[PDB]
Design a protein around this ligand. Structure first.
Ligand SMILES: CCCN1CC[C@@H](COc2ccc([C@@H]3c4ccc(O)cc4CC4(CC4)N3C(=O)c3ccccc3)cc2)C1
Ligand SMILES: CCCN1CC[C@@H](COc2ccc([C@@H]3c4ccc(O)cc4CC4(CC4)N3C(=O)c3ccccc3)cc2)C1
Lengths: 206, 228
């Protein structure tokens, strides 16, 4: 029922912290710690907790890598040619099979700068990834009504910046089309790298 | 020219550029994959002729036309297949004479997973009553979008052109929806629903590439036509 402004506010307040840091051992350990904070960020995505724990775990399981990636890209925009994994972990391109995904993450940062992605826009993109990455009946309806509620919020945000309706649906399309690339990097990321379901449930206890 | 097209003129060109539906040869579990590979192989030739007719596409360099098609060709086959199958619940219409069900897919190692994912996309389009004009817009977006992030001054010019053309197709999708009577919220919501499905088609494409591995040269040579 929330308004677009209240939607934004709740998402902005739910942002997880930036965490701090043998390269792959460091990156795995950092990703494990971020995942915990992702779970509690997910709880605060409005509409998410209305789902069953089984649906909650299905979405998180299908989207966690995409979420770590778009968050990496978001904090790496002001660091051209480099990924800011952690504030004490800034790697560039020279830092088997890694450089292709690293090249893809950089081009994602480059695209975010080209579009001048806004923070408000970013937290809507993350929520869309959470609810959409796994949607493929009452549950789906709800997921799609909330995805619809987030669409309404992205348009409001753009209208508030003074964009014409033409520029609004154009920018919305451009933002949602980046999600395919992020899905693509996640797929390629999964290849390059007890069930995660059971760990995801356990994290949902705190 | 492509950027001066109206929405209707964009729909019209996309519809006219549509490739024909092909058939399989005039069956068993053992020959299934040879038939599907023959089909894809012939469809690809026609896919090239279709892409050359998507407004703005031939304004690109050859090398960039190849890149876009290497990146999108499987997604385009799949979205074509899903569209053909929309009106056959539980079934994929690879060709009018090659309609397969989940069980026939179970026959191959790893196939049913892709097959269940393709079948759900088809039911999702069905639930949305996807129109033909929106379909040809979605397939064009896949063509121009799928590789635009895996590419010089010249390359910057190229990507800017692609995103301008992708904007015109977005104006065209919205024009269709307003033409279909939709309110301005529903227009934005349906546009988003359609473009999020493309994420799932990408997902299917990559899982599909792993199954097919479990072409650059060819594309240039269908694209790099002489003028004789
Ligand atoms: C048993 C518990 C299971 N966990 C869950 C899966 C299992 C390892 O998952 C992991 C392991 C490492 C990562 C990092 C990481 C960390 C933090 C970040 O913000 C972002 C990223 C980005 C990422 C995803 C591409 N990555 C890389 O290194 C990288 C590789 C190639 C090119 C560029 C970057 C992410 C997830 C351990
Ligand atoms: C030099 C070129 C080399 N060729 C070009 C690539 C190389 C074969 O690639 C191929 C081979 C087969 C296909 C079919 C096919 C055919 C027609 C169609 O319209 C759509 C599809 C969809 C598709 C992609 C999922 N598929 C399957 O069977 C299938 C698998 C798992 C579950 C369900 C279906 C598509 C591409 C040989």
């Amino acid at each position: 029922s929330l308004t677009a402004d209240q939607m934004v506010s709740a998402l902005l307040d739910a942002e997880p912290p930036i965490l701090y840091s043998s390269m792959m051992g460091l990156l795995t350990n950092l990703a494990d710690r971020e995942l915990v904070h992702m779970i509690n960020w997910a709880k605060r995505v409005p509409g998410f907790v209305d789902l069953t724990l089984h649906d909650q775990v299905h979405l998180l399981e299908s989207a966690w890598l995409e979420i770590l990636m778009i968050g990496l890209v978001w904090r790496s925009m002001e660091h051209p040619g480099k990924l800011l994994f952690a504030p004490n972990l800034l790697l560039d391109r020279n830092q088997e099979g890694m450089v292709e995904i690293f090249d893809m993450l950089l081009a994602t940062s480059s695209r975010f700068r080209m579009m001048n992605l806004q923070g408000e826009e970013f937290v809507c993109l993350k929520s869309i990834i959470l609810l959409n990455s796994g949607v493929y009946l009452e549950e789906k309806d709800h997921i799609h009504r909330v995805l619809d509620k987030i669409t309404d919020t992205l348009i409001h945000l753009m209208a508030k910046a003074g964009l014409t309706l033409q520029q609004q649906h154009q920018r919305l399309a451009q933002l949602l089309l980046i999600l395919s690339h992020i899905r693509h990097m996640s797929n390629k990321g999964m290849e390059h790298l007890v069930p995660l379901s059971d760990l995801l449930l356990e994290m949902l206890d705190a």
